[PDB]
Amino acid sequence: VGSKTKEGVVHGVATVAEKTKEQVTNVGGAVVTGVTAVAQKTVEGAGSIAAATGFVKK
Amino acid sequence: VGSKTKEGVVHGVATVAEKTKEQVTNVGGAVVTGVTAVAQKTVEGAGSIAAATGFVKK
Amino acid sequence: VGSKTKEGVVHGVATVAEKTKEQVTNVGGAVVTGVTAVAQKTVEGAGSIAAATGFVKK
Amino acid sequence: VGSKTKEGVVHGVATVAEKTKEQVTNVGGAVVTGVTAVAQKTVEGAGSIAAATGFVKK
Amino acid sequence: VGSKTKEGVVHGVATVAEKTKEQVTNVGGAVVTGVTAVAQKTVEGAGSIAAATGFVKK
Amino acid sequence: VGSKTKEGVVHGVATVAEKTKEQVTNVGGAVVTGVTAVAQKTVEGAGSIAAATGFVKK
């Protein structure tokens, strides 16, 4: 077989964040912020970085 | 077989963020912000970075 | 078989964060912030970095 | 005076180098290679990244 | 005076080097290689990252 | 005076080196290799990362 396989992998990531401000006001939601490397490998489901699937009575 | 395979992979990502401001007001939604490298490999589901699938009575 | 396999792996990540401010006000939501390397390999479920799936009566 | 002052400064530098080969055969010379951020603030002299001034009898 | 002052400063530097090969054969020279952040603030002299000034009789 | 002052300073430096090979054969020279953050603040002299000034009779 001799089979290499990479599922859902993050390699080699350099980041410099300098004097970044940030402000979040959230109510019942999903929020994702900033420097964001993401590998996903979902099987038989909903892959998703920000998911908001609920009721909010404001 | 001898079969290499990369599913959902992020490699080699450099980022410099300098004096970035950011402000989020969310209510029941999905929000994704900033520098964002994303590999997804969904199978039998909805791949999606910001998903908003719910009721909101503001 | 001779089969290498990487599922859900993060390697080689350098980060410098310098004078980053941050402010979160959350109510019933999901919030993810800052420098964020993430590998996921969900099977038979919803992979997701910020998930918000509940009721909020503000 | 009340003066901010940056002379010769390197801030905020991200780098990913992946499977870079390199081969140098040098004889009496200057060689500079690879990823190279350089701030230089010479006063009353020769600023220079590769300088080669000697004798070479090959 | 009341003065902030940065001379020759390197702040905030992220680096990932992965499977980098390198080979140097040098004879009497200067060689500088790889990932290289350099702040330099020479006064009354020759700033220089690779300097080669000698005799070489090959 | 009331003065802050940074001369020759290296702050905030992250590095990941993974499976880096390296080979140097040097004879009478200067060689500098690899990941290299350098702040230098020479006064009344030659700042220089690789300096090669000698005699070499090969």
Author numbering:
A (entry chain A), B (entry chain A), C (entry chain A), D (entry chain C), E (entry chain C), F (entry chain C): 40 to 97
Which lines from the publication concern this structure?
α-Synuclein is the major component of the filamentous inclusions found in several neurodegenerative diseases, including Parkinson’s disease (PD), dementia with Lewy bodies (DLB) and multiple system atrophy (MSA).
Filaments made from a 1:1 mixture of wild-type and mutant human α-synucleins were of at least three Types. The structure of the minority filaments (Type 2, 17% of total) was solved to 2.8 Å resolution. Two identical protofilaments are linked by pseudo-21 symmetry. Two putative phosphate densities were also present at the inter-protofilament interface.
